[PDB]
Design a binder for these strands. Structure first.
Ligand SMILES: [K+]
Ligand SMILES: [Mn+2]
Ligand SMILES: [Mn+2]
Ligand SMILES: [Mn+2]
Ligand SMILES: [Mn+2]
Length: 135
RNA sequence: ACAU
DNA sequence: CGATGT
């Protein structure tokens, strides 16, 4: 209904899907970039969206912030809620790195607590999420 | 059909 | 046009 401007917005960017994956988090109110992941050689859009939310959870918890997180990915929001990323990406030598990051994110979710609301950014009403890569 |  | 997901 209404944008919660006091929030963190996260998004994936990619070159190919599957392909090179990165993500970033920004202050929804100002667009200031708060964190950026170094590009990962092979992953999927949804894996990256998942890692971006989990990194946001860790970022906010470390600084004792109760702000919500916006994501535009229905899939990734559900995976975080389930603490399980149900990706179809083959597990092989080429995909080992992204799968290590995903498994490690799930492990974090299963060993830590948080109250952070994870909210759907309503692209159809509000335009692109402020962490979008412009591609 | 919806979300990327 | 193709791919990732519920
Ligand atoms: K979008
Ligand atoms: Mn997105
Ligand atoms: Mn796993
Ligand atoms: Mn985007
Ligand atoms: Mn895009």
């Amino acid at each position: 209904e209404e944008i919660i401007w006091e929030s963190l917005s996260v998004d994936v960017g990619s070159q190919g899907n599957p392909g090179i994956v990165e993500y970033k988090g920004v202050d929804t109110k100002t667009g200031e970039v708060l964190f950026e992941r170094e590009p990962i050689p092979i992953g999927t859009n949804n894996m990256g969206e998942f890692l971006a939310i989990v990194h946001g959870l860790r970022y906010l918890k470390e600084r004792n912030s109760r702000k919500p997180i916006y994501s535009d990915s229905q899939t990734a929001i559900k995976w975080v809620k389930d603490k399980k990323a149900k990706s179809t990406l083959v597990r092989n030598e080429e995909t080992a790195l992204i799968w290590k990051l995903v498994d490690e994110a799930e492990e974090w979710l299963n060993t830590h607590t948080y109250e952070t609301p994870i909210l759907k950014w309503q692209t159809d009403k509000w335009g692109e999420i402020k962490a979008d890569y412009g591609r």
